[PDB]
Design a protein around this ligand. Structure first.
Ligand SMILES: *[C@@]1(O[C@H]2[C@H](O)[C@H](O)[C@H](O)O[C@@H]2C(=O)O)O[C@H](C(=O)O)[C@@H](O[C@@H]2O[C@H](C(=O)O)[C@@H](O)[C@H](O)[C@@H]2O)[C@H](O)[C@@H]1O
Length: 226
């Protein structure tokens, strides 16, 4: 009985440029499936026109993965001269008890490393400073370095928030409601990698593997320029 996100033309283009993964990395719905009215408990359109992702379990996901309209997977040069831009209007609800971190946007390499995760976190400690209930940027220091650089972007609000990721020429910037919160972070450690965007709900390290992470997107698009 779930309404499909494809019924809203504001999502037609990104869905044509996406495939849906759930509850792990396996695709459950390709672009043509998504455009043909795909809907389920973990991926549906709310009555007020949010595309809502929901998932439970450790490291489980309901996530769109960037695709080309050709059906090729997106695999752009992570540090190339072409600008790649993802924009999303996201409402992060108060998360259920036991939900501790939810990744909502990513730049992922074509193998096994997230270049960037934007995530909500219950708590984070960065160089001795503890922040509670914030939205975080995490940039991995390398493919062979499991550590990452972390930057608080925003105090969590239930309000619809505009996020923009701009990647170009080995730098990455993030704006939140129009304000730069990460200014040209270096990602040269992904020279020679290819990359793609992801958006949705990716549940990291829950303390209740039964609780549902839930994320709502009012707008979502990804583009490039030359
Ligand atoms: C890292 O995030 C991982 C996510 O949780 C998902 O599993 C994703 O699929 O892969 C991400 C990744 O590998 O980058 O998780 C590790 C971790 O949990 O061990 C983080 O490494 C720790 O980070 C903290 C910190 O920087 O605050 C350190 O205190 C700790 O010693 C580890 O370095 C990593 O930063 C990243 O979040």
């Amino acid at each position: 009985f779930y309404t499909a996100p494809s019924t809203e033309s504001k999502f037609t283009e990104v869905l044509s440029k996406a495939k849906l993964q759930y509850p792990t990395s396996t695709t459950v719905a390709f672009a043509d499936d998504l455009l043909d009215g795909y809907a389920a408990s973990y991926f549906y359109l709310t009555s007020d026109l949010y595309m809502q992702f929901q998932v439970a379990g450790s490291s489980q996901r309901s996530e769109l993965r960037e695709m080309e309209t050709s059906g090729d997977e997106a695999a752009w040069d992570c540090t190339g001269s072409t600008a790649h831009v993802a924009s999303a209007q996201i409402a992060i609800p108060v998360q259920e008890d036991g939900i501790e971190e939810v990744t909502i946007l990513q730049v992922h390499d074509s193998d096994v490393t997230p270049v960037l995760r934007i995530s909500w976190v219950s708590s984070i400690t960065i160089d001795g400073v503890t922040s509670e209930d914030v939205v975080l940027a995490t940039i991995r220091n390398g493919i062979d370095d499991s550590t990452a650089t972390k930057t608080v972007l925003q105090a969590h609000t239930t309000s619809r928030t505009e996020f923009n990721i701009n990647v170009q020429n080995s730098k990455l910037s993030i704006t939140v409601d129009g304000t730069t919160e990460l200014d040209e972070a270096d990602i040269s450690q992904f020279d020679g990698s290819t990359c793609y965007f992801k958006a949705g709900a990716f549940n990291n390290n829950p303390t209740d593997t039964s609780a549902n992470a839930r994320i709502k997107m009012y707008e979502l698009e990804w583009v490039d320029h030359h």
